[PDB]
Design a protein around this ligand. Structure first.
Ligand SMILES: [Mg+2]
Ligand SMILES: [Zn+2]
Lengths: 653, 1320
DNA sequence: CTCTGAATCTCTTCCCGCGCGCCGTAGGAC
DNA sequence: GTCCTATCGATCTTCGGAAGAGATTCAGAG
């Protein structure tokens, strides 16, 4: 190809074939002109050494070059590896009908939607837009509709909002480690230029919102839409593929709001009255007559689905708080209130959400998750949950704890100053005195944070769980648990040298206060190690997943039951003393290999190829079973695949 | 106390406490004094071009038997100055001219010349020059050479565990690294046999070198090993005991004599026994024959009588051998002492590997191991071996390498030759063997005493050497064969190889970086980067934790925070604020001398290996105003260890609390509080802020802004003191005062400011005045702001009023919520200037034209072109507008159209034309401009001298010799024709009218030369006829998706542009401008951002009291009282300031700049205590909790509990969204395989890359995948059938088989590999 | 006299996206 | 100045990758 003016792009192969053909022209000449052996052995060497270049330049002694020692890319350099066809153009390739933008958070989306800019939708869906303007007969054909789109006329949006009206679009970040990293959403149009993503789903992508771009793809055919809607739509993927654990796990602000809504404060406005239901609980809150975390009694009703699966509705007085009454109004009618009657936090609400999925199923769970999100945002707003430096709490015992520990370290030093302790022992004991100070500072600081709240119970003071701003965030599990708050206001503690060996004199300061220059300079030996690790690791992790999919990709589940009776045995992992995992982690949802007996003898408990779903694994936990034999894909005697029963539960379903 | 006239306009209230004894060095002396060190000639020939010339000249051929020799060099002034050069697009360079003298000798005679011909300065090349901003201009583009940091030349000893063999033991290695030439490695084999190699070639037995130097083995053994002797007298074979050779080891055998036995069999030996051994004088002793039967002999033993061998040096003895050789009369037999701990036998072991006999057989082995396939040959071998280590053409420890070598061998002196010598290698071997004998230490590799900085003035001296090295090879041959009769030096050399060498360097080297001219900080922190990469360095892909990590010698030399996280952490570092390059290139940094017990205010720079010899107190350490330490014991660092030591034990002290950081981090306030992750991301995000439209000042800073904005050279700085004569936002012109004038000059310094222009990153850079007409200015005052500055403080961003709270989730996770009030104010709008160019050529079908007569297009488009064929200035343009109506013969409308998507106002055009080619009225329009701009500024001197000279007529008329019957109405040289007599005054008149004519003739050549600069065309590339460049300015606003960041490494997209009524507002009804999320502060431990907010809030409060005191018409004496009460606030803060001396005028002029918040300094590790922020907030009428109750503008409800409100500083980053939003329906495809193009600069499709395909396969989704990688992508049929089915709305595909896979088949079948598709 | 141990050499692998920026055959002979 | 032909067939490709595995080279001996 020509480039900028009358110059051909140096198009490597044509320099290699040029080498060959020149040499061959000479060799035909010198053969027919009958040169002596030494001359033809010259040209014959130079020809063999040139065809060497053309095939796989650089397996020779040295690669040949035509610039500042750039080796020319030969054929075999075009086939292989990271810039060659197999990886660069075949296995994955660039695609039309795609676009990208910076993502930004859209709180108002229902979980299945994402907003995408009108400019992109109009530049992406063009073929479908022509397929409406001809169908309106409003444009004569492509030749006119093209112009009618270019002019961006007033009709086109009402057409676009009919084209798109339910065409799923696929959003994926990159890298995309796992299936949840491409998902489909129904688009809704936006005026701006960012892609408005749903808040809960950002966690799945590991999409942070700090300027993290994301690509979008339109699926074109009917089949690509039916696959997108049935499989990849976000509503169908509330669980992880890898472990039976939600991926909708609540966003930090949502859980902050729900924690704040459900606390009890022992003094409050409107405390102690009795109400006929959530609705007048809300009227009581919204008019400002009762505080949200005030204690109350309410009439409640709750629903249970019986042994058949049909609802029994029940009603009672409940003793609770205004905000637990309001929150009960969001829960779908089939869960027990005992799941809400407690000050909620990130673990407690994940199990809340999980139990919704356990009891109702998917379709209520996605909507309940949406409502949780909206609720948490709204009460987190009213909560005004700011952060402020007067809210960093230093336990003044910290001053004494250093002033004590410093002298005891100097006792280890004075022995050393008398030769009375060894050079190893002096060090490895001093760092334990600093550990004994550090545990004490941390414990005093967590006690002080809980200690900061005490209030008059109409007469005489009494204590309660601390409304201290940073402590709400830790105690809720929103962000920054013990290891962070310890550094913010307790002490930063011991630090490590480049070779991992521990510093003899720790950072007894904390970030509420200043580090001096040395404490700061040593602090960076931590952090720069942790960043070097990130930037170094991100290669080897990827080369690991490549090697794995590129060995696993041959498997597909391809029979129902291979017909084995063989398998392997599961127990709690008992080691180092106590059990590091229970049986219910391992065995849940495999199929039994062999008939599982009652603990004891001759009474069978589970038939010999039964899926041990949850009601079976709770039953095993009712028994004194320790070892269970189950089928495993390593033992499944299907040729060229695996049988379904040997694989067992599909974790995402 | 005094402040300069640009300080005394916004005296930043300073909270610092430590008195800054050393004021920050000019932040680019790293670069400028490097290049000055290259460009200056220096008779002490090291450093500079002159050193390189003297590295090659004199130059000669033996067969020519004549020479040419360098005498001296001159460097002419650069053909175009920087401004004009940056327009015209060439490189700013200087012509290199060299006095070469060619000397012609004769045969037979003494060498006295037949002739010698000094060529009058042969032209040698064009070396670029550095601009005073420290940047090179290389093709109009402005480029910066980052300093390299790499392993200094020297000798280095090393060892490792597990990386080698892993059986618990460690292997030791020594290297000699020259500056230029071959590396030599010595290393042991595991079995302690010693080996050597050159340049990581094959392993050789190490004595092969000592052989090659023609030591015999007997001599080698006298170089390395201690003697033990046997004397065959008083009884057969007595033995020479040196007592100290037995200690700690077991006396496993009979040694005794004469009285008390020292130590009998089986017992250790100790001091008291050695003293008894000495007191008995054990000079000879009895030992059993097993002892002598252990020995290896030192020296050669032929039988003299037969003349024939019985034993040889390092041959091993036995009783029968000892008998026959002492029986042969060799009554002194001599051997070596080799205790396994202290005297291991490694060289004898090496002589058991050794295949060599003597010198020649080793040279044979050398030449065959090094040059396999060439013949060894006695006359030929040395022409390898000497050029490995002993010849200047190929081995060279520079003066730094020799110094480091001598220091490591513990030599007395460091003025030494650059080549090795026998004893220079032997000393390395001995030191390596001492290490293996356990009596020494290995060096830490990654220590800033072993790695040295190379900067531009050294990289370019090497590349210029590569030049002279290729001229060497040409000129030697041309001289050797030449007749010497007609040749003159300009025949002998030609510039082309030098120019190739240096131009490729400055143009394209891995270190000639394109400058990040993003904002004035990013200019500087780039000019002072330290890079480990590039030529002679390591590589970003090929290093690990050993070098990325920080090291204890970094303190004060390299900033630990400011490194570009990502694939090259710590392979790039930023040279710390105060640090400096030593003479040799090692990084050295200033410390205060602690003299006995007082901190003396004198600074000594310490390199990284001077530092370990002292104990140095941390910068915070207090003093008593005499300067004794206040503390009785104090924290110091010492040997990388740190601990507490006594008062008056300590020996040096840090110079400043800023010493540990770079400017990039030194600008963060309250850095004392931040996690070093978030310090790092802060100090990296500051260098990306784009200059906003109306930039001002950070309210909380560090007082480093007053230095970054000035030293970065981008504010225009007053070269000499004077008074402002005129200002108009394009020119500023200063009547310099006569106390700093040069006597013949007009005395007037213009400053033509640069206006709207593209930065290298497309942000605009318009300088604006800060002065007023008639205002006085002093040398070094800022006259004009740069981009991102105001009043000469750095000012990247805008001091936006932020409150920390959740808001319905719009600021979830990280996002920033923003009020419409900020965008309405044009707070963050920013101007992006693109350059588009239309080239035109003398193509093969014929020459192009620029015209409006374009074929196939009507006035519907052409309405914006003028009649010449270029767009009007001030045309506002959009996609597809024709900017330049180029056309090609045989007529084709190829014309410059504005690319898709972009839009803007055309702010300027430029036109460039070859020689011998016609202009047009847009070239004449630009000539009219530039001529007039030169002529005006010249006239404003000629006018000033004319006025002075006619005064110099008038005054000496009016004062005496008056002729003023009529005077001032007349032409003031027609004043000569008045009738004054031939007394001296008429001769003064005649002479000073001739001085007036010559004053006209003076400018009569100066303006001609200037107009000749403008009249000419330009040095176009071959093929082009002319080029025109057209600039589009876009005023981009701010919108969802744009990125903003704080200084603390907090960052977000802005997520919604909320209308004012929805912002929270306070109990006074002012809404907040931004709502940040709180949870990021504990979760990422960057709580310094809260104290910036509170101190920012107080900063607003003082302006709030001042603005009220200016709306109310308070008298200055009350106003001065409040301002003074603000500056004196706090503890014993460093600064003192007396508004009593500000003359009221300047008190109002000060107030008029505080009236939007008092600016504050919080120097990095020395900031305000909390108790001083509270104190300032109490001086304002503000709530000292810092928090305020807020209400929600959606309802007017109160928020529960107050929330933080205050003035953070926020930067718009250059990652703004419309520069990234992209989408493609269909368009281009690549040629080799039909997959879509990739880009925004091309209308590309996103890569559905490898990992996404596994992601689809992991759903069941097969049809989606089939589509994505065929129909949507590659199948040349299917995609056009798909498109039509979609416009038909059929929703069906025909999938085929991708053409990229057919490419593969042919690319395999283009090997002799028959791959084929198969049927069943 | 070469058979199983071990020893030195080369070959091969090293995240995914993305955006800029520039830079892009020579020398000799007719 | 343009067109055609060839590369260090009279040097010196960078030491600062590890690894990890194989092909290919050598011990102590039956
Ligand atoms: Mg991110
Ligand atoms: Zn099976």
């Amino acid at each position: 190809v020509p480039l900028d003016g009358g110059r051909f792009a140096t198009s490597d192969l044509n320099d290699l074939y040029r080498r060959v053909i020149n040499r061959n022209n000479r060799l035909k000449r010198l053969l027919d002109l009958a040169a002596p052996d030494i001359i033809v052995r010259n040209e014959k060497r130079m020809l063999q050494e040139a065809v060497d270049a053309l095939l796989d330049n650089g397996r020779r002694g040295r690669a040949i070059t035509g610039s500042n020692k750039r080796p020319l890319k030969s054929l075999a350099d075009m086939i292989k590896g990271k810039q060659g066809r197999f990886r660069q153009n075949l296995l994955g390739k660039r695609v039309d009908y795609s676009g990208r933008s910076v993502i930004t958070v859209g709180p108002y989306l229902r979980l299945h939607q994402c907003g995408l800019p009108k400019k992109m939708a109009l530049e992406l869906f063009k073929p479908f837009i022509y397929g409406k303007l001809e169908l309106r007969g409003l444009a004569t054909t492509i030749k006119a509709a093209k112009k009618m789109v270019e002019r961006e006329e007033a009709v086109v949006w009402d057409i676009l909002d009919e084209v798109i009206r339910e065409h799923p679009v696929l959003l994926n970040r990159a890298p995309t480690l796992h299936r949840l990293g491409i998902q489909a959403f129904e688009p809704v149009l936006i005026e701006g230029k960012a892609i408005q993503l749903h808040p809960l789903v950002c966690a799945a992508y590991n999409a942070d919102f700090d300027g993290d771009q994301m690509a979008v793809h339109v699926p074109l055919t009917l089949e690509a839409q039916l696959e997108a809607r049935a499989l990849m739509m976000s509503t169908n993927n509330i669980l992880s593929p890898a472990n039976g654990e939600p991926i909708i796990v609540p966003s930090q602000d949502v859980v902050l709001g729900l924690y704040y809504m459900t606390r009890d404060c022992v003094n409050a406005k409107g405390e102690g009255m009795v109400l006929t239901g959530p609705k007048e609980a809300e009227r009581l809150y919204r008019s400002g007559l009762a505080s949200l975390h005030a204690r109350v009694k309410v009439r409640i009703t709750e629903y249970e689905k019986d042994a058949n699966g049909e609802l029994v509705a029940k009603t009672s007085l409940k003793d609770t708080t205004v905000g637990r009454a309001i929150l009960w109004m969001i829960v779908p009618k089939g869960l027990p209130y005992s799941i809400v009657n407690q000050a909620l936090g990130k673990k407690a609400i994940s199990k809340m959400l999980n139990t919704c999925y356990r009891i109702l199923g998917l379709k209520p769970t996605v909507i309940f998750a949406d409502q949780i999100m909206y609720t948490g945002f709204a009460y987190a707003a009213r909560s005004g949950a700011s952060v402020g430096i007067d809210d960093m709490v230093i336990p003044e015992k910290k001053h004494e704890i250093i002033s004590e520990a410093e002298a005891e370290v100097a006792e280890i030093q004075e022995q050393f100053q008398s030769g009375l302790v060894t050079a190893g022992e002096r060090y490895n004991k001093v760092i334990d005195i600093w550990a004994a100070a550090n545990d004490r500072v941390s414990k005093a600081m967590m006690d002080n944070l809980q200690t900061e709240t005490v209030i008059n119970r109409d007469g005489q003071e009494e204590k309660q769980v601390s409304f201290n701003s940073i402590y709400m965030m830790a105690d809720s599990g929103a962000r920054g648990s013990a290891a962070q708050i310890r550094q913010l206001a307790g002490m930063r503690g011991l630090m490590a040298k480049p070779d991992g060996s521990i510093i003899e004199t720790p950072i007894t300061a904390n970030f509420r206060e200043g580090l001096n220059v040395l404490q700061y300079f040593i602090s960076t030996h931590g952090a720069r190690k942790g960043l070097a690790d990130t930037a170094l690791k991100t290669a080897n992790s990827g080369y690991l997943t490549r090697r794995l999919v590129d060995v696993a990709q041959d498997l597909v589940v391809t029979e129902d039951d291979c017909g084995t009776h063989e398998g392997i045995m599961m127990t709690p992992v008992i080691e180092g003393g106590d059990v590091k995992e229970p049986l219910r982690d391992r065995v849940l949802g495999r199929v039994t290999a062999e008939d599982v007996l009652k603990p004891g003898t001759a009474d069978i408990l589970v038939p010999r190829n039964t899926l041990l779903h949850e009601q079976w694994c709770d039953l095993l936990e009712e028994n004194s079973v320790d070892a269970v034999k189950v089928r495993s894909v390593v033992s499944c005697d299907t040729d060229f695949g695996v049988c379904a029963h040997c694989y067992g539960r599909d974790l995402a379903r | 106390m005094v402040y300069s006239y640009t300080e005394k306009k916004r005296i930043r209230k300073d909270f610092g406490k430590r008195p800054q004894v050393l004021d920050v060095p000019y932040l680019l002396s790293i670069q400028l004094d490097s290049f000055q060190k290259f460009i200056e000639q220096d008779p002490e020939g090291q450093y500079g071009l002159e050193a390189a010339f003297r590295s090659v000249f004199p130059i000669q051929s033996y067969s020519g038997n004549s020479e040419l020799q360098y005498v001296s060099y001159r460097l002419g002034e650069p053909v175009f100055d920087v401004q004009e050069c940056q327009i015209r697009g060439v490189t700013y360079s200087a012509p290199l001219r060299v006095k070469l003298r060619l000397v012609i000798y004769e045969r037979e005679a003494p060498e006295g010349t037949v002739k010698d011909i000094k060529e009058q300065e042969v032209y040698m090349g064009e070396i670029p020059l550095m601009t005073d901003n420290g940047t090179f201009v290389i093709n109009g583009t402005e480029r910066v050479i980052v300093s390299q940091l790499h392993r200094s030349p020297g000798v280095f000893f090393d060892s490792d565990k597990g990386k080698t063999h892993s059986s618990g033991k460690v292997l030791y290695n020594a290297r000699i690294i020259p500056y230029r030439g071959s590396w030599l490695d010595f290393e042991f084999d595991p079995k302690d046999n010693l080996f050597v190699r050159i340049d990581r070639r094959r392993k050789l037995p190490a004595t092969i070198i000592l052989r090659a130097l023609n030591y015999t083995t007997e001599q080698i053994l006298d170089l390395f090993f201690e003697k033990v002797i046997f004397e065959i007298r008083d009884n057969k074979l007595q033995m020479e005991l040196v007592p100290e050779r037995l200690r700690g080891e077991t006396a496993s055998f009979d040694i005794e004599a004469n009285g008390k036995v020292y130590v009998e069999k089986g017992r250790r030996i100790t001091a008291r026994h050695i003293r008894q051994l000495e007191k008995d004088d054990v000079k000879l002793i009895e030992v059993p024959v097993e002892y002598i039967a252990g020995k290896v002999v030192a020296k050669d033993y032929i039988d003299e009588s037969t003349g024939e061998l019985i034993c040889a040096a390092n041959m091993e003895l036995s009783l029968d051998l000892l008998a026959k050789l002492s029986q042969s009369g060799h009554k002194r037999i001599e051997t070596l002492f080799t205790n396994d701990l202290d005297h291991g036998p490694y060289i004898s072991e090496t002589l058991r590997v050794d295949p060599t006999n003597d010198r020649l057989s080793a040279l044979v082995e050398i030449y065959r191991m090094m040059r396999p396939g060439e013949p060894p040959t006695r006359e030929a071998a040395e022409s390898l071996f000497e050029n490995l280590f002993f010849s200047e053409d190929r081995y060279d420890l520079s003066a730094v390498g020799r110094m480091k070598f001598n220091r490591s061998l513990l030599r007395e002196e460091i003025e030494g030759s650059g080549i090795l010598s026998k004893d220079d290698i032997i000393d390395v071997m001995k030191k390596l063997i001492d290490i293996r004998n356990g009596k020494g230490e290995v060096d830490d590799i990654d220590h800033l005493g072993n790695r040295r900085i190379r900067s531009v003035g050294e990289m370019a001296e090497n590349q210029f050497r590569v030049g002279l090295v290729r001229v060497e090879r040409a000129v030697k041959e041309r001289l050797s064969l030449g007749d010497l009769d007609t040749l003159m030096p300009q025949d002998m050399i030609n510039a082309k190889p030098i120019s190739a060498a240096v131009k490729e360097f400055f143009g394209s080297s891995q270190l000639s970086q394109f400058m990040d001219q993003n904002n004035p900080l990013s200019e500087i922190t780039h000019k002072r980067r330290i890079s480990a990469l590039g030529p002679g360095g390591l590589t970003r892909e090929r290093a690990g934790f050993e070098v990325r990590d920080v090291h204890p010698t970094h303190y004060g030399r390299v900033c630990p925070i400011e490194t570009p996280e990502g694939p090259n952490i710590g392979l790039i570092n930023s040279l710390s604020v105060y640090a400096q390059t030593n003479e040799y290139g090692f990084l050295e940094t200033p410390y205060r001398k602690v003299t006995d017990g007082v901190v003396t205010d004198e600074i000594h720079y310490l390199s990284a290996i001077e530092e370990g010899n002292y104990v140095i107190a941390q910068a915070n350490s207090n003093l008593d105003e005499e300067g004794h330490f206040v503390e009785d014991l104090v924290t110091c660092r010492s040997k990388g260890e740190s601990s507490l030591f006594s008062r008056d034990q300590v020996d040096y002290m840090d110079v400043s609390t800023q010493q540990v950081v770079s400017v990039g981090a030194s600008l963060i306030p309250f850095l004392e509080h931040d996690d070093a992750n978030r310090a790092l991301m802060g100090a990296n995000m500051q260098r990306q802020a784009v200059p906003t439209l109306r930039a001002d000042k950070p309210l909380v800073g560090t007082g480093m802004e007053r230095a970054v904005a000035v030293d970065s050279g981008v504010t225009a700085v007053a070269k000499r003191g004077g008074v402002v004569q005129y200002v108009d936002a394009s020119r500023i012109v200063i009547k310099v005062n006569e106390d700093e004038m040069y006597p013949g000059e007009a005395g007037i310094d213009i400053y033509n400011l640069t206006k709207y222009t593209r930065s290298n990153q497309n942000t605009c850079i318009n300088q604006m005045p800060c002065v007023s007409l008639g205002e006085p200015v002093e040398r070094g005052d800022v006259l004009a702001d740069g981009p991102s500055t105001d009043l000469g403080e750095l000012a990247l961003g805008q001091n936006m009023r932020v409150a920390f709270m959740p808001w319905n989730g719009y600021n979830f996770e990280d996002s920033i919520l923003v009020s419409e009030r900020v965008v309405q104010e044009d707070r963050f709008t920013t101007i992006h200037i693109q350059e588009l160019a239309c080239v035109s050529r003398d193509t093969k079908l014929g020459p192009e034209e620029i015209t409006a007569d374009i074929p196939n297009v009507g006035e519907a488009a052409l309405s914006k072109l003028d009649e010449s064929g270029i767009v009007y200035i001030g045309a506002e343009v959009t996609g597809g507008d024709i900017l330049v109506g180029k056309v090609t013969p045989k007529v084709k409308d190829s014309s410059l159209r504005v690319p898709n998507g972009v839009s803007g106002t055309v702010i300027d055009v430029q036109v460039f034309t070859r020689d011998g080619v016609e202009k047009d009225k847009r070239a004449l329009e630009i000539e009219e401009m530039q001529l007039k701009q030169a002529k005006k500024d010249l006239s404003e001197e000629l006018q000033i001298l004319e006025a002075g000279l006619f005064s110099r007529i008038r005054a000496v008329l009016v004062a005496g010799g008056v002729e003023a019957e009529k005077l001032d109405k007349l032409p003031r040289d027609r004043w000569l024709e008045l009738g004054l007599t031939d007394e001296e005054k008429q001769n003064q008149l005649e002479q000073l009218a001739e001085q007036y004519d010559e004053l006209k003739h003076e400018f009569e050549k100066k303006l001609e030369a200037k107009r000749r600069k403008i009249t000419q065309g330009d040095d176009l590339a071959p093929g082009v006829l002319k080029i025109v460049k057209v600039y589009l300015a876009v005023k981009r606003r701010i919108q969802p998706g744009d990125k903003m960041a704080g200084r603390h490494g907090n960052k977000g997209v802005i997520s919604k542009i909320n209308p004012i009524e929805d912002m929270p507002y306070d109990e006074n009804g002012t809404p907040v401008d931004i709502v940040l999320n709180p949870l990021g502060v504990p979760s990422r431990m960057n709580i310094g951002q809260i104290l910036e907010t509170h101190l920012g809030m107080a900063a607003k409060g003082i302006g709030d009291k001042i603005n009220a005191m200016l709306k109310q018409q308070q008298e200055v004496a009350k106003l001065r009282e409040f301002i003074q009460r603000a500056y004196d606030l706090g503890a014993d803060v460093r600064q003192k300031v007396d508004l009593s001396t500000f003359s009221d005028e300047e008190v109002m002029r000060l107030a008029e700049n505080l009236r939007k918040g008092m600016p504050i300094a919080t120097p990095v590790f020395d900031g305000a205590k909390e108790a001083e922020i509270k104190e300032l907030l109490k001086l304002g009428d503000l709530p000292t909790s810092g928090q305020i109750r807020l209400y929600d503008g959606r309802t007017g409800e109160q928020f529960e509990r107050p929330v933080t409100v205050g003035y953070m500083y926020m930067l718009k980053l250059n990652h703004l969204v419309d520069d990234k939003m992209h989408a493609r329906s269909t368009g281009s495809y690549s040629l080799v395989t039909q997959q879509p193009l990739g880009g925004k600069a091309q209308f590309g499709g996103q890569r559905f890359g490898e990992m996404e395909v596994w992601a689809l396969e992991a759903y069941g989704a097969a049809y989606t995948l089939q589509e994505m990688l065929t129909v949507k992508s590659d199948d040349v049929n299917g995609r056009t059938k798909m498109y039509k089915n979609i416009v038909d709305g059929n929703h069906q595909m025909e999938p085929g088989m991708p053409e990229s896979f057919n490419v593969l088949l042919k690319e395999i079948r283009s090997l002799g590999i028959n791959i084929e598709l198969e049927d069943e």
